[PDB]
Amino acid sequence: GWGVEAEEFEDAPDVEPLEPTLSNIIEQRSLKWIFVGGKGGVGKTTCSCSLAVQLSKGRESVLIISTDPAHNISDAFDQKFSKVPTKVKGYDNLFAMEIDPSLGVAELPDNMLSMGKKMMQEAMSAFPGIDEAMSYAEVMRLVKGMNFSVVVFDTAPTGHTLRLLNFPTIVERGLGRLMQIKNQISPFISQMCNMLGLGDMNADQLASKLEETLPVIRSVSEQFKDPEQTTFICVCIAEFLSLYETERLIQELAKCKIDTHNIIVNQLVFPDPEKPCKMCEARHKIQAKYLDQMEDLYEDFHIVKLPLLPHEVRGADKVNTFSALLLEPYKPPSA
Amino acid sequence: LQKDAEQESQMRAEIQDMKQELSTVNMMDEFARYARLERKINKMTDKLKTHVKARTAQLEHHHHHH
């Protein structure tokens, strides 16, 4: 208000293209939610795993949540995983898990109360948007009560990741439907129990289930909009369709006020004078065209480049290799 | 003869000029120009839509009085 514009004093520094690394992620000690999305398959999964490995060195404990329907995370680490997080081989801090596409909340984490729960879940089925958000909320409540220093999401290349990023909004809007479903199931539960089973205790259950999870949901909502605590990382390849979907994703992230400032372009081919390949030269021509378009348009991002690894490279070693190329830019193959 | 009308007319005219320019851009060859222009269009459209919804709320306040 009273301060000088501060641009009078020393003119303006010149635009420096940001460093093609993810070190800005590491130095952000405040980050507790890191999403890794975009349209990618094995590359996106391996990138998220390499990010976790590098994060574990400077952090206290790191988690890996994979909502990708394909179980490529278990493949890459050379170790299988499941909903219960297990320690990764050779690392004390790393922990990882694999959530189902249905989020594994089909069974929530007497028999009359079980029937009432089954009635609730079945009625919620008729609203897949709200039910999906509730399953997101149960998962986030478990991971928050787990109390880890930072979590990395290997998200799905579909729009369900966008739903996950707006799950508190979906829950807040779906409160009316939830109360309606509760208001239609509770009297049947109470009537059935009293009239035929004497006990009325089952009616009191599920009352305080929504009285303490909601503050957690509101805190997560306030936490996602914070750039210091939440950031999105986009994975793509240097082709037109990938660039188009990337721009669409960034635009929808801006709409949701979810921050993103790191892009990963993988499967990049670099022609080598040794072992020539003409189709690699043509693919490089196309990649060069759209990577120039990216470096022009995305000057406000850290554009980390990753080369197409030879097909033989697999498992923890390609993870180890990527774990370095995300902090040191790859060197050209010109001997 | 009100500012909220003049503002909408100017915003709609500028959005239309931007859309006319975007029809010239090739999305594949000059993607950065296409994207930056589409971002400006979407921002100005969201601003116009918020202004229109505010005036619609004023109309509902008068037409269907509280």
Author numbering:
A (entry chain A): 7 to 115, 122 to 347
B (entry chain B): 39 to 104
Describing publication, verbatim:
The eukaryotic guided entry of tail-anchored proteins (GET) pathway mediates the biogenesis of tail-anchored (TA) membrane proteins at the endoplasmic reticulum. In the cytosol, the Get3 chaperone captures the TA protein substrate and delivers it to the Get1/Get2 membrane protein complex (GET insertase), which then inserts the substrate via a membrane-embedded hydrophilic groove. Within the membrane targeting stages of the GET pathway, the homodimeric ATPase Get3 (also called TRC40 in metazoans) adopts closed and open conformations in response to nucleotide load and interactions with other pathway components, allowing binding and release of the TA protein respectively. However, the cryo-EM structures and native mass spectrometry of hsGet1/Get2 and scGet1/Get2 show they form a 2:2 heterotetramer, which is stabilised by Get3 and interfacial lipid binding and is important for efficient TA protein insertion.
As the Get3 TABD helices α4 and α5 are not resolved in the hsGet2ΔN/Δα3’-Get1/Get3 cryo-EM structure, we bound E. coli purified hsGet3 to the hsGet1-CD in the absence of nucleotide and solved the crystal structure of this complex to 2.8 Å resolution. Surprisingly, the structure showed a heterodimer, despite multi-angle light scattering (MALS) confirming the hsGet3/Get1-CD complex was present in solution as the expected heterotetramer. This indicates that dissociation of the hsGet3 homodimer occurred during crystallisation, as previously observed for scGet39. The interfacial zinc ion is accordingly absent in the electron density, asserting that zinc coordination is important for dimerisation. There are otherwise only minor rearrangements of structural elements found at the dimer interface within the hsGet2ΔN-Get1/Get3 cryo-EM structures, indicating the hsGet3 fold is independent of oligomeric state. In the crystal structure, the hsGet1-CD contacts the hsGet3 monomer via the more extensive interface I rather than the smaller interface II (classified previously for scGet3/Get1-CD complexes). In the hsGet3/Get1-CD crystal structure, helices α4 and α5 of the hsGet3 TABD are unambiguously in the same conformation as in the cryo-EM structure of the ctGet1/Get2/Get3 complex (as in state 1), rather than the alternative conformation present within the hsGet2ΔN-Get1/Get3 structure where α4 and α5 are reorientated by ~90° and 180° respectively (as in state 2). Therefore, the hsGet3 TABD can adopt either state 1 or state 2, with the latter correlated with interactions with helix α3’ and/or the hsGet1-CD via interface II. Indeed, within both the structures of the hsGet3/Get1-CD heterodimer and ctGET insertase, Get3 helix α7 is tilted inwards at least as far as the position of hsGet2 helix α3’ in the wild type human GET insertase structure. This suggests that binding of helix α3’ pushes this helix within the TABD outwards, which could contribute to the further rearrangements of α4 and α5.
